[PDB]
Amino acid sequence: VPRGSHMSSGKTCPTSEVSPACYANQWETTFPPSDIKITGATWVQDNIYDVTLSYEAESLELENLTELKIIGLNSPTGGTKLVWSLNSKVYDIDNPAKWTTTLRVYTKSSADDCYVEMYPFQIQVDWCEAGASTDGCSAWKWPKSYDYDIGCDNMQDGVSRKHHPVYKWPKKCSSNC
């Protein structure tokens, strides 16, 4: 089957087992609606996994986008993952409203220790500045800059200060545990 390392389908998680690490009766609902989630995971080694993050959110157009980045990431490759940046010359999405990126992440054991989960992080969005097109920006009914907070915080009574949970998946991406 594979002709080297890091090409093995056998370290890939069942997608049915990649799911929210927590649930809440109330999440933060500031800023445009979004759906932010992990859709796939692959075990690298130890507590390190490669994952696919999927982002969908009400947006302006690519031309209006100044910067779009994941920050606060607990990762062996560092805490920032820019997917678009006019300043830093990163051009890795086609549409701010719907995109995916891959992240290499550290994990911790979940409350069910058949699973692991990633650590909290933020997605920062910046529109309409610093060289971006201003076309449509006056009509935008939301702030030009904002953060989505991702995490399973220490809730009381099911009330979270985060917009969305972090995700969990089976330890080692095993199908059976």
Name the experiment that determined this structure. X-ray
Contact 113, 171 (CB under 8 A): yes
Tell me if residue 74 falls in helix, strand or coil: coil
Instruction: Return the number of other C-beta atoms located less than 10 Å from residue 90's C-beta.
Output: 15
- Which structural domain, as residue segments, surrounds residue 41? 1-177
In 3D space, the residue among 35, 47, 37 whose CA is nearest the CA of residue 15 turns out to be: 37
Order of strands across the sheet that contains 145-150: 90-91, 81-85, 65-71, 121-127, 145-150
Quickly count: other Cβ atoms within 10 Å of residue 127's Cβ.
24
Does an H or E element contain 82, and which?
strand 81-85
Neighbouring CB atoms inside 10 A of 133's CB total: 15
Bridge partners for 69 per DSSP: 82, 124
Task: Specify the DSSP class assigned to residue 159.
Answer: B
Tokens 């075990």, residue?
43
Domain count, the chain: 1
Is the separation of the CB atoms in 114 and 171 below 8 Å? yes
Closest by Cα among 73, 148, 82 to 107: 73
* Resolution to 1 decimal place, in Å: 1.4
Helix or strand holding residue 20 (H, E): strand 19-20
